Amino acid sequence: VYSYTEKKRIRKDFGKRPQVLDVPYLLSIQLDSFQKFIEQDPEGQYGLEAAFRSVFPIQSYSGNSELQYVSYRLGEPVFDVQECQIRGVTYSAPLRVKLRLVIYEREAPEGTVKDIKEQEVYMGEIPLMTDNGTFVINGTERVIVSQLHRSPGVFFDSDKGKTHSSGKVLYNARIIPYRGSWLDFEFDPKDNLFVRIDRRRKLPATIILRALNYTTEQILDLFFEKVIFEIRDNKLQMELVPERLRGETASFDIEANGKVYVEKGRRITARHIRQLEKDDVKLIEVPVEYIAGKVVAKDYIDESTGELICAANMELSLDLLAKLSQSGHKRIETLFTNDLDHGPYISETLRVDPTNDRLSALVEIYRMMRPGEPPTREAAESLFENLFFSEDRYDLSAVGRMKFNRSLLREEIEGSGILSKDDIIDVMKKLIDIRNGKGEVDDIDHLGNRRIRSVGEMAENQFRVGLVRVERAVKERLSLGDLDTLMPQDMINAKPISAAVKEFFGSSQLSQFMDQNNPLSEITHKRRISALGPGGLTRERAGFEVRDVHPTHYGRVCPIETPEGPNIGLINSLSVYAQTNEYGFLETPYRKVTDGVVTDEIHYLSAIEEGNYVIAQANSNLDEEGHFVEDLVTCRSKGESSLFSRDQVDYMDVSTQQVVSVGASLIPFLEHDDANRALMGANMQRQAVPTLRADKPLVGTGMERAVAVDSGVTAVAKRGGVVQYVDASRIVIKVNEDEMYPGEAGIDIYNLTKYTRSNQNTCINQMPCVSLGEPVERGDVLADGPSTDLGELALGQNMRVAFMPWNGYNFEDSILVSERVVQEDRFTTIHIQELACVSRDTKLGPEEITADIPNVGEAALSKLDESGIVYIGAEVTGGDILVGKVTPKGETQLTPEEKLLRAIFGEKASDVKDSSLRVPNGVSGTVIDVQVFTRDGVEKDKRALEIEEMQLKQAKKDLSEELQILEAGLFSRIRAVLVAGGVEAEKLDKLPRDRWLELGLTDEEKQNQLEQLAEQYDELKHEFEKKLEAKRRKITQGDDLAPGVLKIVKVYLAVKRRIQPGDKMAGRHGNKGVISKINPIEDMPYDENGTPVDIVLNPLGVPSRMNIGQILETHLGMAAKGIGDKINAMLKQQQEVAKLREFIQRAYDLGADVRQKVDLSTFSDEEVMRLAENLRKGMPIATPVFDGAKEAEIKELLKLGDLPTSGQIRLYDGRTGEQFERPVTVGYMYMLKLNHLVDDKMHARSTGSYSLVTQQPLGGKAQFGGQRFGEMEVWALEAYGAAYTLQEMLTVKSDDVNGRTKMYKNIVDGNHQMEPGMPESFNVLLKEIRSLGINIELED
Amino acid sequence: YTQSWKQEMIADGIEASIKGLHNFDETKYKNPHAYITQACFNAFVQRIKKERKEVAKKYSYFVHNVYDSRDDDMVALVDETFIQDIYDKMT
Amino acid sequence: VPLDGGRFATSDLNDLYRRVINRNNRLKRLLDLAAPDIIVRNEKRMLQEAVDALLDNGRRGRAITGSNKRPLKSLADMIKGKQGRFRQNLLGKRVDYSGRSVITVGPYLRLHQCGLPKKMALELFKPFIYGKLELRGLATTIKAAKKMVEREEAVVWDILDEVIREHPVLLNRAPTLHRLGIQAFEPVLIEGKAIQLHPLVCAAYNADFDGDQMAVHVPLTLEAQLEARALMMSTNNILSPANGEPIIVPSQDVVLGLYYMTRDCVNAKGEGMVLTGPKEAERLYRSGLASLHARVKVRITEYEKDANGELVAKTSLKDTTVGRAILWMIVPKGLPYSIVNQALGKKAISKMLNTCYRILGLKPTVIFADQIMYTGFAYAARSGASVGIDDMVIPEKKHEIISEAEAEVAEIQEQFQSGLVTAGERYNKVIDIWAAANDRVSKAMMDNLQTETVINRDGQEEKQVSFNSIYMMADSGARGSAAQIRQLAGMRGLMAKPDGSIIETPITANFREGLNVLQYFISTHGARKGLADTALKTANSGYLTRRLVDVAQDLVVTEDDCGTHEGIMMTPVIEGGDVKEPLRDRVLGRVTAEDVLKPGTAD
Ligand SMILES: [Mg+2]
């Protein structure tokens, strides 16, 4: 069972694995984001609502006047899309906000509001997203590609190796806020630990600690453990729990209770300590000398002196022990020490500290931050203060606090947006542990860390920027609050927010023209993610690592599709099912593998929570019961793969193709091609310019439906009904009633566009595909876009192709064609270039669009119209004129050669001069349409009036149909009311149905109903008039102009560029090539059956480029066509349907057990015929990416044709009619027409302009530029004694102005001879160094 | 906006305050702080208006040259130089 | 404003200048006020920083960013980098009388000429055409000529024809590696838009025909035409300057042709009969009365100028294959047959070319090479050397070797997991066993493929070199690596790791069968690796060759014989084991100072 629009041409699908989940809606990313950006909801938590409830409420400078926010609403599109597309305006809306100013009663906060004063305030014009996830900025259609960046939080960097080359590994830890200032801690080659702020100079972290108002003793407390002494009779029995004595040698016999356990000079074992805990020792003998190195815990005062017998962190000495122990404070504290269990790195940092207090600590903070300034305590205070805890300059998004407490393994997801002293200490502790050897680092590209942005996010960010600006302003405004003389608007400047928004959209490197020449590329240019621009690395900052692929990329990012060249992996794309976690993280559908069942339940999992599990690959069977029919199954847990038990696993993939992006999910027989060739394939596929007709590729991938319907160029019903009035210009469906709303029973009117320009000058049009009267269901395709076909994507044309060498005409990559395809013109493509001529006003007076032009041959002038606008259909070429637009003269530009004539004729002669819109040299073609734009209230001319009358007549038509359709039900009910009570036969029809309430019907409540529904009729009439004249006003009227202009005209050239030796064509398999020569039909190799073969590729292609996929495709395609010659023949000779359906069903059986399971006995036997005629051209075949069609089925189908199972057959030359030994391979293969056309590349330059700062001939092709002649060439020339060549090359043809003039003369008068001269730009350098005082000279 | 401008701005304001210190009553205007404040304020706005309309003049000179070499002109940009060169001129 | 078309630049120099001059006057003015010297100090500082930023921005703390967050340009920035005067306009410079386009083949061309579209041809010579017209009187003034050339008054073409008669042109590709990246030609005019190309030279240009773009310039002075003529013509550049190798190597498809020609079938039509002239060979081939690759006795002759210049000829009877003779009719004079009796893969034709050039001179060689390309293309065409799903034979015992390999590895792994060996050496054993199975299946396939000729010879059968188009290429050496095949049929072993480690389990599959997801994923990673390395490699090679060319840049043969009898005693190199360069090479073409003795003394 299928969509009734699917039954129109059903494609056979090989493929053994069923699916449990459909493909989701592709563009869902942009939709969800931008939706989430403008959504009035509780708490907001996001978008406008967030920034509003953040910045607002807001008040005076404690001046007891407050500015509070309540609510908001998005205004409206004043127009719709196509309207803007016409004019060139930004599709947008305003933002209506609810505010209130509330001043306070005098000398009391809670003191009554001086005035509750609110108002609705205008602010900003946010653009809006089409239903296809794009934008309209200035007519044009940009797209916002989403970024991906390093999530905010904290990270543990390793930096192995090259640190000091000592072999030791350094470390560092970095905290990054969403917005704010980062922070770093790190090491020196000497185990010294340091802070660094804003990647500025390095400072001892001790300084930070001091800033925390921290006694250095409290620092020591934080990090190290405790060690306790008591002064004995002698030998200082220290407290001990035996554990810490794991890993030490006995310089003295470890003893307790007298019974020694360790001998003098014995390294204690762990098991010793074990039996020692069994002995439970606490106090131990100590050679006091052994205590020389144990630094003091902290300070130590005396009592009689009352003075510090020791300061915090003093190096312990024996006499020092005397002083200490003398004073009887037997409780002595020092610190635990170790090297491979507790490295004592804090102590030395303390040593190096030059600081004493919190205050001088802040002083250092300042000095390092702002240099050289003699500080005031308060300066540094405020600096550090707002540096890390004030929302003015720092924030962690919720995802921040999340990741933060997460990496810290703590158990809270919530928190603040700002830090805490704790947090920093926690960082330092963790890093110290890492330094000891407990704890592991992170790596960069591990997707568990890289988060993803969207449009709504960066949107609200720029929004915050603008809001902060107007915040500063209006805050200072409320500062001068003139009480009660101010509504909450007068203080409000609503310009700059809109300014910033418009900037962002119209200008941000995360915004570019929608790549628009394919329903494919249009969708590739949205499901694309990068790490460039603000918050990403730089195209030449590119580090190797990020530019690679991380095994975590599984099913989250296409492995194979990225635009190669100067950047790889940076502009990689997104896979099929991959969603986005609410935090901008990725997830992936996954099925539960319960006790023995791979059930049908599914979830979505991150890049890290995933790591705990083992998950089954796709291509492995189960017994319809989840039990892998095998036992050791291919699985994966973490950067790994292995055979696993029948019950180790936890999950399974959803479907094979969930590994790749859609831009590859098509190129069939993928698992028979290398990745490189697959890469070139997908990329060169992305640029298949749409040609004239549209034929499907015969071999597909079963995944071309969900491309179209999710693309835009289609046209799809919104509810079932009946096609009622088709036309090549528009579609009229009567909706069905149960799918209809009370008011406006209505008719779905689809206004397909005709030929309009794509962003790269390629036609588009939405041609219908339906039959008048046919029904459609709720959501079927109605009209097709470029390179589309009945809902099938169709990017090229499939062709009978042969594989063999031929007179070198396929030597390197020459593709060789016959006339017979360009005979059919099946590779022609139209092109559309918009040309524009405006009318502003310079000084000296404004300008005109007259047909009145000086010093031009009237021959040309004739071609224009009376206005000055050439007509529709004039085949035009370059060096001509399309509009006449003339300017006043001006003075400094008056040559004597016209001073003459202006003297004679009277100065009414040289007052004006031409600016006409020409035809850009190098182009030709035909005019299709001309748009003319003028200021309204300013005069509108002939053409303007014509466009007016046409468009209004048109727009009236549909609503005319509307009323005349919806009304007639009223006369239905009317006569239904007159029927009962003497129905009249010919009064109701031979007379106007309006002429029913003039005939006297027996006047009871039924005539009351007559007059009732008559008034209702007339009311609906008049309000229909209201609607239509609203439309008339809106359309008839002109259009505002960016003031400074008067009126502008746009003209639409068009050209049909067909094909030529030089163009670039390629199959989806990265097998590109230029068509070299096109011989006559008679010379193409022909089979015995007469039929010649279109193109003859090269055989050498496969060995080097190990991409078998092409050949297998070709064989399958020959097979697929091999159903045509069967059905077509069976049908041409007439035939009853029985055998037809029979052969159909058979051909559809044709394979191993697949998901297809179609049946044709279903049909009412006519649609059978429809299907057959769809087939008549050939049979369409489907094969998913990794659920393919093995060789055996291909041999099979081939037999079901009539062909030799090899696929090879014998052929004859067409120039000697003799047989080809070694039978060759022909089949049917999809070829695409790559849009690098030669006529865009050829370019010459006899001589033209020159740059002015240096008279070198200008560059580029738009300019008549000369080629680039390089230093490499300079050498390649010096290798030969090619002297005069090089000289005359680089002076006489480049810069020697005198010289080049002399040359030009001598050559155009028959004398090849050169005057050397001396370069010019050299003199430029000479004077350029003369600029600086370095006097340069040129000795005799 | 611009560090480079800001340097010259402050230069202006400083000289302005220098010369204007000459005359400052005490019996009235019991504060010199705001005096110098608004003095420099005005100096700044003077400087900035000068520079704005200078670069405006640059735009104006530009837009009056479309006759460079051959066909194939541009429409998008020119309108924007124009529209700025108009906006600034509004003042 | 430059205003020189396109977007407009800002020539920001003045700005600095402006602001610079600004401060200067301020200084005076403030000195003119008797300013508090602290602030006069400040203004002195401002001036100093200003002139600084004018001379070379950035050498201070904060380089004065221009705008949009960009640093501006001092007097020094016009000077340095790959955009300062030197590396931008003093050395590299766009030049007039030039053109650029896409390229194609056009095999009908002989060696010394290039195709050329009509249009570019027309513009590139406008001055010449004007001169010719006005010499002819067909026009009278330059304006008349401009108009005539505009709308192609149909005379023009023949005019242009005369102008081209021998006027050279110079062709080049973009990344100019070496002395042959740029050459000369004599064009033939095409009513097309692209450039044909004598399909041999495409090697020097390192050029695929997949959308390359070549550039073309034109000499003006007669002297220039001469320079090009004698010194950069394709008829003058045949021995790679890196090494006396002939650099005109018939590349790949001529190769397949020739190989398919010089060969032998076990028993073909009329094999082994006797003939008396390669004329008859041709006939009996085309007449379809004799097969091509078939043993046959044929009478021939051959020449040699071994004597004093005189190429004495002399006959004999050989037993060879037909196409051997068919070709042999082309081999020019001074060559012995045994040069050809072989099966003639690629390097054979290379060395043949070389000796031909060495003994014969130049013109014989070029004519030879041209004829060779012709014949090869023709016979490859006749061949029908296709390829299809049956060109890939399969090791039947693939599954065998693989099943036993995995059976063992399961054992050794459960041995370790039982705690009987170390993980590192267990990994090593796995490495080695997969290497073993790899090489074994390689032998299996390659051998099975390379010999499956089993065809009676009026008797039982014999087994000679088989004829798989794939195998035919390989043994031809025309295109493709034996390892390429290995990947096609054999499992392509194991791949790398982002580190450079190797995955434990290998790629068990071929390309015939399809890869499963994971293996394919891994291959993906490796390919991306290699590509990024391609990028960086091109990069570094750039700056390398830059320094290289720059370091010599001046060494020129100034004289003949420095008057000395020293030098170095060269010897073959021995890596300890096998030797690498026979002494024959270091000596070949390097003038000896001292003479040489025999090992026997005084000899
Ligand atoms: Mg190339």
Numbering used by the authors:
A (entry chain C): 2 to 1341
B (entry chain F): 63 to 153
C (entry chain D): 253 to 855
How is this structure described in the published paper?
Bacteriophages use bacterial RNAP to transcribe their own genes. Herendeen et al. developed an in vitro system that leads to the current understanding of T4 late transcription. It was found that T4 encoded gp55 enabled RNAP to execute low level (basal) transcription, which was further activated by the sliding clamp gp45 and its coactivator gp33. To initiate basal transcription, bacterial RNAP needs to form holoenzyme with gp55, which recognizes T4 late promoters and confers the ability to form a catalytically competent RNAP-promoter open complex (RPo-gp55). Gp33 and gp45 further activate the basal transcription activity of RNAP–gp55 holoenzyme by forming a catalytically competent transcription activation complex (TAC-gp45).
